C-alpha cells in the first residue's frame, strides 16, 4: 500500500490551494478595468519566406532581430535574412523529423532536434564556409520537443521522456536533468536572466526550474489539456501558456497562480505557439484554425487577428526589438508581420 | 559597402536555391511511410525504380498523441496488426479520426492465425462467400481473418469519406508499392475532381 503518504500529497495539495485563495485578494481584470485598451491591432504580412518543402515545426529569431532559423520536416534548417528575404544558409539535417530549432544569442550556432532523440549543434561561423555539425547531444530518450541556448556552451533541451536537461556542448554530456513532469515536456522558455526557465508538458502543468540548482521551484496547474506552448513575460515575473483546451493563461511566479485566461466562444482549437510583444502588452497566440489571435495581455480581450496562413500555425516569434512577428505554419511559409 | 555585402548575398542565396531544386526533385520522388504496430529507424527500399522510405519509431514512449502529428505528410501509414487486437482497433480508430491524420491513408497488414472470447459476436459470424481464398488453408481460419478484417473496415467505412483509404491485407513489399500507387492516383483524380 501507499496511502500512508498518498493522502499526505492531497492534504498538502489542499493547503497550497487555499494559500493561493488567501493570496487572490483581487483579479487582474479588476485592477486593469480602467486601463484604456490597445485598440485594434492590424498587422500586415510584410514578408513571406518561400523555401521550405514540408511543414515548418519551429523557427527562432536572432538577437540582432534580422536573421532567423527555421526547421522543416523535409530535412532543412534554412537561416533566412528577414530584411532581404535571402537564405543565408540552408543546413541539410541527418534526420528529416525535426521538431525544434534554436539560434545562439551570440549568433554562432544553431541547434535542432526531433524524433531522432538528438540535439545537433551546427557551427555557422566556421573557417570552411560549409556549415557542419559542432556536436550531437544524445542522452535523451524520446523525441526532442524544444531547445534553447544559454550561451555558446550550455543549452537546455526538453524532450519526450518527460524530462528536461541542461547540456554542456564542449563535453557533450548533460550537466543537470530536470525531472518531475509526468507527461512529455512540450515547450520551454528561459527567463530574461536565464537563471530560471518554465516548461509546459502534456500533464496540463507548467513547472518553474532553477537552472543552476537543478530543482523544481513552483508548479502551475490551471489548464485542462496538453500545454503546447510557453513564454515568459518580458519582466520575467510571469509567463503565459497555451494548451489544447483552446485557452491561453497568464500565470505568475510570485503570486503562484494564474491571473488571466484568454478565451473565446468561437475558439475551440488548441494553441500551438505563444509570444509576447516587447513590452508584454500583447500576447500573440498561434492557433490550429490557422490564424494568430493577438490578445491584450491586461484586458484579456482580442485586439487583432493575424490571418494569413493556409495550414496550422506551428511556431511564432517576436523579435528582440519588438519590430516583427515571424509565424511559420504547416504550409511551408514563414510570414513576417508588423 | 553597398553591393559588396548585398549582391554577393544574393549570389550565395542563388547557390542555395540551385541545391534546393535538386532537393525538391528528390523530395517529391521518394515516398515516406510510417510503420507502426535511435528514436527513428529509416529503412530505404525501392520497388520498380520508385524509392520508398519507411520510418519505424524506436526509442519513443507509448504516449503517441504528440509525435504522430509529424507523420501526416507521409504517403501511407503502414499499420501492422499482430486484448492486443482490441487495442489495435482502438489505435486504428484514433489514427483514422485524428484531425491531422484525416488525409493520410492506412495500409493495414495482418499476421496471426491459430477469438470468441474477446469477440462474442464472432461466434455469430460466417465468412462472406463473395471473398474467398484460393489455396484452401482451413475453412475455420478464413472465417476468422475475414472477421478481424471486417472489424477494421467497420472503422474505415464510418464517416471517413474520400480523403484517406484503408488497404487491408493478410500476411509484401510489392503490396505497399501497389497501394501507394493507388493513393497517389486517387489524389490526382481528386485534384481534377474526378473522384
Amino acid at each position: 500500500e501507499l496511502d500512508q503518504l498518498r493522502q499526505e500529497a492531497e492534504q498538502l495539495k489542499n493547503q497550497i490551494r487555499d494559500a493561493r485563495k488567501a493570496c487572490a485578494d483581487a483579479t487582474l481584470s479588476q485592477i486593469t478595468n480602467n486601463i484604456d485598451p490597445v485598440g485594434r491591432i492590424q498587422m500586415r504580412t510584410r514578408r513571406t519566406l518561400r523555401g521550405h518543402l514540408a511543414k515548418i515545426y519551429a523557427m527562432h529569431w536572432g538577437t540582432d532581430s534580422r536573421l532567423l532559423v527555421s526547421a522543416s520536416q523535409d530535412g532543412k534548417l534554412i537561416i533566412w535574412d528577414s530584411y532581404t528575404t535571402n537564405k543565408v544558409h540552408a543546413i541539410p539535417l541527418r534526420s528529416s523529423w525535426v521538431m525544434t530549432c534554436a539560434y545562439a544569442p551570440s549568433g554562432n550556432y544553431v541547434a535542432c532536434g526531433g524524433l531522432d532523440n538528438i540535439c545537433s549543434i551546427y557551427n555557422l561561423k566556421t573557417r570552411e564556409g560549409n556549415v557542419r555539425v559542432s556536436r550531437e547531444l544524445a542522452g535523451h530518450t524520446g523525441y526532442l520537443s524544444c531547445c534553447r541556448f544559454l550561451d555558446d556552451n550550455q543549452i537546455v533541451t526538453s524532450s519526450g521522456d518527460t524530462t528536461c536537461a541542461l547540456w554542456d556542448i564542449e563535453t557533450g554530456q548533460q550537466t543537470t536533468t530536470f525531472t518531475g513532469h509526468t507527461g512529455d515536456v512540450m515547450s520551454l522558455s528561459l527567463a530574461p536572466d536565464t537563471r530560471l526557465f518554465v516548461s509546459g508538458a502534456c500533464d496540463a502543468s507548467a513547472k518553474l526550474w532553477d537552472v543552476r540548482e537543478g530543482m523544481c521551484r513552483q508548479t502551475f496547474t490551471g489548464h485542462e489539456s496538453d500545454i503546447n506552448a510557453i513564454c515568459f513575460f518580458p519582466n520575467g515575473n510571469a509567463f503565459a501558456t497555451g494548451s489544447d483546451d483552446a485557452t491561453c493563461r497568464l500565470f505568475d511566479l510570485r503570486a503562484d497562480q494564474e491571473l488571466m485566461t484568454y478565451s473565446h466562444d468561437n475558439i475551440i482549437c488548441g494553441i500551438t505557439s505563444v509570444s509576447f510583444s516587447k513590452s508584454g502588452r500583447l500576447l500573440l497566440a498561434g492557433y490550429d484554425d490557422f490564424n494568430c489571435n493577438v490578445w491584450d495581455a491586461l484586458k484579456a480581450d482580442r485586439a487583432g487577428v493575424l490571418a494569413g496562413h493556409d495550414n496550422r500555425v506551428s511556431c511564432l516569434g517576436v523579435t528582440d526589438d519588438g519590430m516583427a512577428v515571424a509565424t511559420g505554419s504547416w504550409d511551408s511559409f514563414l510570414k513576417i508581420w508588423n | 559597402d553597398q553591393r559588396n555585402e548585398e549582391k554577393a548575398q544574393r549570389e550565395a542565396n542563388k547557390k542555395i536555391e540551385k541545391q534546393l531544386q535538386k532537393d525538391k526533385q528528390v523530395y517529391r520522388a521518394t515516398h515516406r511511410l510510417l510503420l507502426l504496430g535511435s528514436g527513428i529507424f529509416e529503412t530505404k527500399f525501392q520497388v520498380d525504380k520508385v524509392n520508398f522510405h519507411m520510418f519505424d519509431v524506436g526509442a519513443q514512449r507509448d504516449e503517441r498523441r504528440k509525435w504522430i502529428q509529424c507523420f501526416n505528410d507521409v504517403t501511407a501509414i503502414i499499420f501492422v496488426v499482430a486484448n492486443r487486437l482490441q487495442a489495435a482497433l482502438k489505435l486504428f480508430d484514433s489514427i483514422w479520426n485524428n484531425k491531422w491524420l484525416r488525409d493520410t491513408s492506412v495500409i493495414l497488414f495482418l499476421n496471426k492465425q491459430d477469438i470468441e472470447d474477446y469477440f462474442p459476436e464472432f461466434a455469430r459470424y460466417t465468412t462472406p462467400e463473395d471473398a474467398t481464398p484460393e489455396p484452401g488453408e482451413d475453412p475455420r481460419v478464413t472465417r476468422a481473418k475475414y472477421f478481424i478484417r471486417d472489424e477494421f473496415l467497420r472503422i474505415s467505412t464510418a464517416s471517413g469519406d474520400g480523403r484517406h483509404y484503408c488497404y487491408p491485407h493478410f500476411t509484401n513489399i510489392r503490396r505497399v508499392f501497389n497501394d501507394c500507387r493507388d493513393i497517389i492516383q486517387r489524389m490526382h483524380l481528386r485534384q481534377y475532381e474526378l473522384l
Partner: nanobody
Amino acid sequence: QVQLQESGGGLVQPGGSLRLSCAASGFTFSNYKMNWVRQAPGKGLEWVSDISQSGASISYTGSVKGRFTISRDNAKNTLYLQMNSLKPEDTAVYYCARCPAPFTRDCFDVTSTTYAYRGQGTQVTV
C-alpha cells in the same frame, strides 16, 4: 487541475453488480469523451468502455458487452459504469480515463507510462 476520483468497487460474488462513479474536477465534463480502463492483476491496461461527449456514441469491449453499461451526467460531472453479471475474469483496477483534448474522436489513453488524465483507480475483486 484535472482530478478524477473514481468510487465504488470492492468485493462481489460472481453474478453480482456494481456501480462505479467517477467525480471529475478541473475541466468542463461536457467537452470530453470519457473512457473506463481496467488493469487486470498480472496484465497490462485494457480499455473497457467509452462514451461520447453527449452520451450518444457508446462503445464497449467485447468481453463486457451486454453486461456492462456506461453513463455520464454532465450536470453533476460524474461518469458511471454499471457492472451487472460479473465474472471472475472481471477483477481488475478500474480507471476513469478521459481523452486528452476536447471535441475530438481520437483518444490515446491506455499507456503503461503515466497517462495524466486518468484517476488513481478503484479495485474490483470477486
